[PDB]
């Protein structure tokens, strides 16, 4: 019932990440969990995002990319350990 | 020959703090203070709840320095043999930083037999409802859950304290804290540096 | 109905400090400046030597702060791939710490063109002492020490809105954000890596 | 010439050590390095002291392990790898 959102800058903020969403018609943002390095608390580049509406999740999957949050294209992808492993590896640049 | 009268040094460049023998200071056992939170995860259950109605938490801690053998010591309170906290605590909504501090100091310690705070030494922010706290606000965080502000509490020449029976008032010399986060945590253990700017006087 | 002006606070209780976008700052180049020393061990020799003639060594270093993405960045003089250092260095016997640092900034980052350049240095942020003629430095003087070999003092240097600087052709200049440095003794050293904290007390504005 | 003075407190400065031998009237001390914890700079409680006179070395070896520095009897020995270990065993 939840997704992953990545290819985000380390400065894309829960708040503004929300601005993007609301402005799709999706108004049920259930928590907003960013992934981060404990050492220094820096955004790992991807946040786990929840949503009660299992329809809007498509309204994001399709609509969120092709919008630009700070010149980067979002990457909404269903939750999964090989996406988990997909993003964790990407934060190594 | 004639020397010229030194000019006033801005406190921002030269802060001079008076330190006294740690032996000047003593404690009288007092009524034992429990902690408001019960288990290890009741504090965040409480943090969430408060942040909703109250908003971001504002914690403050006082750093009280004494000296022995020509080396600064910081007054910690331990309980078990593995737990050290600075005196302080949550502020009330709309309460002043310092005034509140005095209230907490006087609360946790303080003379029942009948506080100078002029300096800020640090800030620590807790981005989420979890353990880690940082000396800054990570760029992706807009609303941090807790703000911890630390002050240098200039101690009087002599003082009697009231250590709640369950606590132990110890005086930690700098080198015990330095580079020893495993022992005292990232805040406490970063005090030696945080204190180095002060020009200390060993009375 | 009318707003109350927030009166100023004591400098010792809240220091508001003005940060500007890295872009406000333009950075040219100048004559490659090699170190006054060379080869690891050699310096310590000189220190043993200087400690006799002049006495304890007095190093000063300035910490220049910019902000990007609402997050302070400390300007660092990189050298090679893994050597960073704060701009600064030794004072000359009997010299005002600050007039000396100023003199080291112009010396180290001076705008070749018009040298009418002033630094606002009004905050010391830490001291570090080197007990023996060795690497170790601690933010304090260990009980068993009377005559330290070197004293290092750091001053926050306030940049004005815009200003043009110049790097020695042999050096690169980076703007390390705080989290790069936090708990990163390996990458940046005991001193530099403790700046995040040492700056955490300043009230930063991001223009 | 060099020795190992130890079994002294971690606040026993160098000067106030020099002043202990200036009581035995030597004044030869050439160098004095201390042994400390790299991690925090604290004193391990013993130092290799450099002296320039073979003779006085006797005075040290012989005498001051009878003076009460800050309450401790200095433990003077020659500079040997097997001696060092007993001193660093005192850190523990």
Sequence-distant (6+) residues with CB within 8 A of B52 are: none
Residues written for chain C: 207
Nearest to A49 by CA among A88, A87, A18: A18
Whole-angstrom distance, CA of residue C206 vs CA of residue C68: 8
Show the tokens assigned to C118.
Answer: 């002033």
- Give φ, ψ of D57 to 5 degrees: -45, -35
- Give φ, ψ of C102 to 5 degrees: -45, -50
- Which of these CATH numbers, 3.30.430.20, 3.30.1370.100, 3.30.365.10, 3.30.70.330, describes A1-93? 3.30.70.330
Whole-angstrom distance, CA of residue C9 vs CA of residue C202: 13
Show the tokens assigned to C22.
Answer: 């890295």
- Give φ, ψ of D72 to 5 degrees: -105, 145
CA atoms within 13 Å, Cβ hemisphere of C65 = 29
- Which residue carries 């993003």 as its tokens? A87
Nearest to A63 by CA among A30, A23, A19, A34: A23
| Residue C176, min C-alpha distance to chain A (Å) | 13
Contact criterion met (CB below 8 Å) for A2 and A85: no
Whole-angstrom distance, CA of residue A68 vs CA of residue A8: 10
Q: Is B113 exposed, middle or buried (0-12, 13-18, 19+ CB in 10 A)?
A: exposed
Show the tokens assigned to B91.
Answer: 């502020």
- Give φ, ψ of A45 to 5 degrees: 105, -10
Show the tokens assigned to B140.
Answer: 């992706």
H or E stretch including B196? Answer: helix B191-196
Sequence-distant (6+) residues with CB within 8 A of B98 are: B117, B151, C13
Contact criterion met (CB below 8 Å) for B50 and B97: no
Q: Report helix, strand or coil for B125.
A: strand
Got the DSSP string for B44-104?
HHHHHHHHHHT-SEEEEEEE-EEEETTEEEEEEEESSTT-EE-SEEEPPTT--HHHHHHHH
Q: Determine how β-strand C25-30 pairs with β-strand B57-63.
A: unpaired
Please name the fold of domain D1-92.
Alpha-Beta Plaits (3.30.70)
Cβ neighbours of C180 in A, within 8 Å: 40
Sequence-distant (6+) residues with CB within 8 A of D27 are: D21
The alpha helices in chain C, defined as continuous H runs, are: 40-53, 97-109, 178-181, 185-188, 195-199
- Assess if residue C45 is contained within a domain: yes
Domain that holds residue B156: 15-203
Whole-angstrom distance, CA of residue B172 vs CA of residue B75: 6
Contact criterion met (CB below 8 Å) for B146 and B134: no
Whole-angstrom distance, CA of residue A59 vs CA of residue A3: 12
Q: List for chain A the helix, strand, coil content (%; round to 5).
A: 25, 30, 45
H or E stretch including C203? Answer: strand C202-206
Q: Which CA distances in Å does B71 have to B16, C144, C198, D83?
A: 15, 10, 20, 30
- Assess if residue B2 is contained within a domain: no
CA atoms within 13 Å, Cβ hemisphere of B182 = 0
**Closest Cβ–Cβ partner in B138, B142, B143 for A42:** B138
Whole-angstrom distance, CA of residue A54 vs CA of residue A57: 5
Cα B176 from chain centre: 16
Whole-angstrom distance, CA of residue C197 vs CA of residue C150: 23
The alpha helices in chain A, defined as continuous H runs, are: 14-22, 56-61, 81-90
Longest dimension (CA), chain D: 37
Whole-angstrom distance, CA of residue C89 vs CA of residue C55: 16
Determine how many CB atoms are found less than 10 A away from the CB of residue A55.
Answer: 8
| Residue A23, min C-alpha distance to chain C (Å) | 23
Give the bridge partners for C129, in sequence order: C138, C151
**Closest Cβ–Cβ partner in A11, A14, A41 for B132:** A41
Give the bridge partners for A33, in sequence order: A48
CATH number of the CATH domain containing C42:
3.90.79.10
Give the bridge partners for C89, in sequence order: C60
Contact criterion met (CB below 8 Å) for B48 and B101: no
Burial D12-22 (b: 16+ CB within 10 A, else e): bbbeebeebbe
Mutate to test the interface with B, among C10, C12, C99 (most CBs of B within 10 A): C12
| Residue B193, min C-alpha distance to chain A (Å) | 19
Angle at B81 between CA B80 and CA B84, to 5 degrees: 80
Whole-angstrom distance, CA of residue D51 vs CA of residue D60: 10
Mutate to test the interface with B, among D36, D42, D70 (most CBs of B within 10 A): D42
Whole-angstrom distance, CA of residue A35 vs CA of residue A9: 12
- Assess if residue B10 is contained within a domain: no
Question: Does the distance separating the beta carbons of B123 and C12 come in below 8 Å?
Answer: no
Cβ neighbours of B134 in A, within 8 Å: 40-41
Whole-angstrom distance, CA of residue A62 vs CA of residue A50: 16
Show the tokens assigned to B40.
Answer: 């290890």
CA atoms within 13 Å, Cβ hemisphere of B173 = 17
CA dihedral angle for residue B95, residue B100, residue B101, residue B107, rounded to 10 degrees: -140
Q: Is B165 exposed, middle or buried (0-12, 13-18, 19+ CB in 10 A)?
A: exposed
Q: Report helix, strand or coil for A68.
A: coil
**Closest Cβ–Cβ partner in A14, A38, A40 for B140:** A14
Q: What is the CA radius of gyration of chain C?
A: 18
- Give φ, ψ of B178 to 5 degrees: -50, 130
Instruction: Pick the residue from chain C with its C-alpha nearest to A10.
Output: C69
Contact criterion met (CB below 8 Å) for C65 and C159: yes
Question: Does the distance separating the beta carbons of A40 and C179 come in below 8 Å?
Answer: yes
Angle at C197 between CA C118 and CA B73, to 5 degrees: 115
Residues written for chain B: 203
CA dihedral angle for residue B182, residue B183, residue B185, residue B191, rounded to 10 degrees: -120
Whole-angstrom distance, CA of residue A52 vs CA of residue B99: 45
Show the tokens assigned to C115.
Answer: 């040298």
How many domains does one find in chain C? 1
Contact criterion met (CB below 8 Å) for D69 and D78: no
Residue D25 in contact with partner chain C when CB distance is under 8 A: no
Show the tokens assigned to B10.
Answer: 């801005």
Question: Does the distance separating the beta carbons of C142 and D36 come in below 8 Å?
Answer: yes
Question: Does the distance separating the beta carbons of D41 and C136 come in below 8 Å?
Answer: yes
Whole-angstrom distance, CA of residue A75 vs CA of residue A85: 14
Residues 44-83 of D with CB under 8 A from B: none
- Which residue carries 């708040």 as its tokens? A15
Going from N- to C-terminal start, the domains of chain D cover 1-92
The three-state DSSP-derived secondary structure of C90-103 is: ECCCCCCHHHHHHH
Whole-angstrom distance, CA of residue B181 vs CA of residue C85: 25
Q: How was this structure determined?
A: X-ray
Q: Report helix, strand or coil for B192.
A: helix
């Amino acid at each position: 019932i939840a997704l992953y959102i990545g290819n985000l800058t380390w400065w894309t903020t829960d708040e503004d990440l929300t601005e993007a969403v609301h402005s799709l018609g999706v108004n049920d943002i259930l928590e907003i969990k960013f992934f981060e390095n404990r050492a220094n608390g820096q955004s790992k580049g991807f946040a786990l995002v929840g949503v009660g509406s299992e329809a809007s999740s498509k309204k994001l999957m399709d609509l969120l990319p092709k919008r630009e949050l700070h010149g980067q294209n979002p990457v909404v992808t269903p939750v999964n350990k090989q996406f988990l492993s997909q993003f964790e590896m990407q934060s190594r640049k | 020959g004639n020397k010229y009268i030194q000019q006033t040094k801005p406190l921002t460049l030269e802060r001079t703090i008076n330190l006294y023998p740690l032996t000047n200071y003593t404690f009288g056992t007092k009524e034992p203070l429990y902690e408001k939170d019960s288990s290890v995860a009741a504090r965040f259950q409480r943090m969430r709840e408060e942040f909703d109605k109250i908003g971001m938490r504002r914690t403050v801690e006082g750093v009280l320095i004494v000296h022995e053998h020509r080396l600064p010591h910081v007054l910690l309170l331990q309980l078990g043999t593995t737990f050290f906290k600075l005196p302080g605590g949550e502020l009330n909504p709309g309460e002043d930083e310092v005034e509140g501090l005095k209230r907490l100091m006087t609360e946790i310690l303080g003379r029942q037999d009948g506080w100078v705070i002029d300096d800020c030494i640090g800030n620590w922010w807790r981005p989420n409802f979890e353990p880690p706290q940082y000396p800054y606000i990570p760029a992706h965080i807009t609303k941090p859950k807790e703000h911890k502000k630390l002050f240098l509490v200039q101690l009087q020449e002599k003082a009697l304290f009231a250590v709640p029976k369950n606590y132990k008032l110890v005086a930690a010399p700098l080198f015990e804290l330095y580079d020893n986060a495993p022992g005292y945590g990232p805040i406490i253990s970063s005090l030696p540096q945080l204190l180095s700017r002060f020009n200390f006087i060993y009375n």
